[PDB]
Design an enzyme around this catalytic site. Structure first.
Site, PDB file in Angstrom:
ATOM      1  N   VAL A 168       0.828  -1.212   0.000  1.00 17.66           N
ATOM      2  CA  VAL A 168       0.000   0.000   0.000  1.00 17.66           C
ATOM      3  C   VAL A 168       0.869   1.272   0.000  1.00 17.66           C
ATOM      4  CG1 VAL A 168      -1.900   1.220   1.203  1.00 17.66           C
ATOM      5  CG2 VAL A 168      -1.909  -1.285   1.107  1.00 17.66           C
TER       6      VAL A 168
ATOM      7  N   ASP B 254     -12.754 -10.751   6.725  1.00 15.74           N
ATOM      8  CA  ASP B 254     -11.505 -10.245   7.320  1.00 15.74           C
ATOM      9  C   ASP B 254     -11.745  -9.016   8.218  1.00 15.74           C
ATOM     10  OD1 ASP B 254      -8.773 -10.501   7.946  1.00 15.74           O
ATOM     11  OD2 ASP B 254      -8.082  -9.490   6.103  1.00 15.74           O
TER      12      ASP B 254
ATOM     13  N   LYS C 284      -2.895   0.380  -4.042  1.00 15.95           N
ATOM     14  CA  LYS C 284      -2.655  -0.961  -3.530  1.00 15.95           C
ATOM     15  C   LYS C 284      -2.165  -1.839  -4.662  1.00 15.95           C
ATOM     16  CE  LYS C 284      -5.226  -4.875  -1.448  1.00 15.95           C
ATOM     17  NZ  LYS C 284      -6.586  -5.270  -0.988  1.00 15.95           N
TER      18      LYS C 284
HETATM   19  N1  LIG Z   1      -7.907   3.604   1.617  1.00 18.59           N
HETATM   20  C1  LIG Z   1      -6.952   3.936   2.515  1.00 18.59           C
HETATM   21  N2  LIG Z   1      -6.825   5.205   2.958  1.00 18.59           N
HETATM   22  C2  LIG Z   1      -5.882   5.553   3.853  1.00 18.59           C
HETATM   23  N3  LIG Z   1      -4.996   4.689   4.373  1.00 18.59           N
HETATM   24  C3  LIG Z   1      -5.011   3.384   4.017  1.00 18.59           C
HETATM   25  C4  LIG Z   1      -6.011   2.924   3.047  1.00 18.59           C
HETATM   26  N4  LIG Z   1      -5.799   1.608   2.875  1.00 18.59           N
HETATM   27  C5  LIG Z   1      -4.755   1.255   3.667  1.00 18.59           C
HETATM   28  N5  LIG Z   1      -4.289   2.316   4.347  1.00 18.59           N
HETATM   29  C6  LIG Z   1      -3.156   2.324   5.303  1.00 18.59           C
HETATM   30  O1  LIG Z   1      -2.002   1.732   4.710  1.00 18.59           O
HETATM   31  C7  LIG Z   1      -1.218   1.099   5.722  1.00 18.59           C
HETATM   32  C8  LIG Z   1      -0.641  -0.210   5.203  1.00 18.59           C
HETATM   33  O2  LIG Z   1      -1.619  -1.224   5.394  1.00 18.59           O
HETATM   34  P1  LIG Z   1      -1.257  -2.781   5.248  1.00 18.59           P
HETATM   35  O3  LIG Z   1      -2.225  -3.401   4.270  1.00 18.59           O
HETATM   36  O4  LIG Z   1       0.228  -2.951   5.062  1.00 18.59           O
HETATM   37  O5  LIG Z   1      -1.610  -3.323   6.722  1.00 18.59           O
HETATM   38  P2  LIG Z   1      -2.759  -4.428   6.906  1.00 18.59           P
HETATM   39  O6  LIG Z   1      -2.644  -5.421   5.774  1.00 18.59           O
HETATM   40  O7  LIG Z   1      -4.066  -3.707   7.145  1.00 18.59           O
HETATM   41  O8  LIG Z   1      -2.344  -5.162   8.272  1.00 18.59           O
HETATM   42  P3  LIG Z   1      -2.590  -6.743   8.397  1.00 18.59           P
HETATM   43  O9  LIG Z   1      -1.286  -7.355   7.946  1.00 18.59           O
HETATM   44  O10 LIG Z   1      -2.903  -6.953   9.855  1.00 18.59           O
HETATM   45  O11 LIG Z   1      -3.745  -6.993   7.459  1.00 18.59           O
HETATM   46  C9  LIG Z   1      -2.128   0.868   6.920  1.00 18.59           C
HETATM   47  O12 LIG Z   1      -1.538   1.470   8.075  1.00 18.59           O
HETATM   48  C10 LIG Z   1      -3.458   1.511   6.551  1.00 18.59           C
HETATM   49  O13 LIG Z   1      -3.974   2.351   7.591  1.00 18.59           O
END
Ligand SMILES: Nc1ncnc2c1ncn2[C@@H]1O[C@H](COP(=O)(O)OP(=O)(O)OP(=O)(O)O)[C@@H](O)[C@H]1O
Ligand SMILES: O=C(OCC1CCN(CCNS(=O)(=O)c2ccccc2)CC1)c1c[nH]c2ccccc12
Length: 327
Positions: free
Chosen positions: A51, A154, A66
């Site tokens: 992300v 999830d 993403k």
């Molecule tokens: N649409 C969005 N707007 C703003 N921030 C976002 C959005 N989608 C994700 N993020 C941020 O991006 C960061 C990276 O998220 P990441 O997917 O690496 O963690 P995660 O997969 O949610 O954690 P886990 O491994 O427990 O699932 C997170 O801190 C999240 O808050």
């Protein structure tokens, strides 16, 4: 063999819809232009995706990009179809574009920007009123996706984005979401360990939307008791033992009997014997202000072994716990 099960609500939503709504593999992806975006910084990298905070140079707006790992690129059409079907729904993240990465071939999803990041960052410092307020906001998103024939699979604090300043919430990461079809046997390797329902832990594949309601119950228990996570299992087997120490073993065995669920022989010597504990046992001086008879009654009706007995998202919205919330 196991006794079949069907959802008690929104059972046949997908049977009536045209094939195009749920047949995601038939969907034709009309790809966008990757050059329209400039990556600013890496927000995180998981086992399946990456992300980034980014800017759309064609309108100067802030976006979130993403990028899918090649291993998780197989079911991209499913996540796209689910995101397009739910777009505009209450508290659902908005998909703005679908592009291809420049260096790698892998698909990249573009979303709206959401302030203040993770729910986990704030969910352990909320007042009683704010726990009630944000629980109602999450319920609006779950009733909406369930009414549209979709299970999230999830639900957890990292998948909820909250803008505390503007009292706004969004349910994110629809990568594990699936269309509900009555009688279908699904993969039990879904959700995060601490939020997995007992149906996944005992390998019962004919589950439904009620899986999300157990995960929501885990989030509520963590918030009102200030204990994160509430059920702290060492692995998937110990996760069920942790649950059994609270809900008791009699109701667990009655659940496996009802659906003729075959228990893994490794559970025979680790489950033991436990009685159903009263929710008042988790109440202490530091968390008493977050607890009420309404909060305990509500939690009791979510955290049930029997997936068919749990409140649905709409019934949860009718509970007295939410009478104090301004609507
Ligand atoms: N649409 C969005 N707007 C703003 N921030 C976002 C959005 N989608 C994700 N993020 C941020 O991006 C960061 C990276 O998220 P990441 O997917 O690496 O963690 P995660 O997969 O949610 O954690 P886990 O491994 O427990 O699932 C997170 O801190 C999240 O808050
Ligand atoms: O500057 C840009 O891309 C730079 C990088 C180009 C290379 N990719 C690596 C992709 N490799 S990958 O193996 O698909 C991968 C690796 C880890 C996690 C997820 C996916 C990372 C971003 C972009 C500019 N516009 C975009 C639009 C979508 C994606 C990337 C961009």
């Amino acid at each position: 063999g196991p006794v079949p099960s069907r959802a008690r609500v929104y059972t046949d939503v997908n049977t009536h819809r045209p094939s195009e709504y749920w047949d995601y593999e038939s969907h034709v992806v009309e790809w966008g232009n990757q050059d329209d975006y400039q990556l600013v910084r890496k927000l995180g990298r998981g086992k399946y995706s990456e992300v980034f905070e980014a800017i759309n140079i064609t309108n100067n707006e802030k976006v979130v990009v993403k990028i899918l790992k090649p291993v998780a690129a197989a079911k991209i059409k499913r996540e796209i179809k689910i995101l397009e079907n739910l777009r505009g729904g209450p508290n659902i993240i908005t998909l703005a574009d679908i592009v291809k990465d420049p260096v790698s071939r892998t698909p990249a999803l573009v979303f709206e920007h959401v302030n203040n990041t993770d729910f986990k960052q704030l969910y352990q410092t909320l007042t009683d009123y704010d726990i009630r307020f944000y629980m109602y906001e999450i319920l609006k998103a779950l009733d909406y996706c369930h009414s549209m024939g979709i299970m999230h699979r999830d639900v957890k604090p990292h998948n909820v984005m909250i803008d505390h300043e503007h009292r706004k919430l969004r349910l994110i990461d629809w990568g594990l979401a699936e269309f509900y079809h009555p009688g279908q046997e699904y993969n039990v390797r879904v959700a995060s360990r601490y939020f997995k329902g007992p149906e996944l832990l005992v390998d019962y594949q004919m589950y439904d939307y009620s899986l999300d309601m157990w995960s929501l119950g885990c989030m509520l228990a963590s918030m009102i008791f200030r204990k994160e996570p509430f059920f702290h299992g060492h692995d998937n087997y110990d996760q069920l033992v942790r649950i059994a120490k609270v809900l008791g073993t009699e109701d667990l065995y009655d659940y496996i009997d009802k659906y003729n669920i075959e228990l893994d022989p490794r559970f025979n010597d680790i489950l033991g014997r436990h009685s159903r504990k009263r929710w008042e046992r988790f109440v202490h001086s530091e968390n008493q202000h977050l607890v009420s008879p309404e909060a305990l009654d509500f939690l009791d009706k979510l955290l049930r072994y029997d997936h068919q007995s749990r409140l649905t998202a709409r019934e949860a919205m009718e509970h007295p716990y939410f009478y104090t919330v301004v609507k």
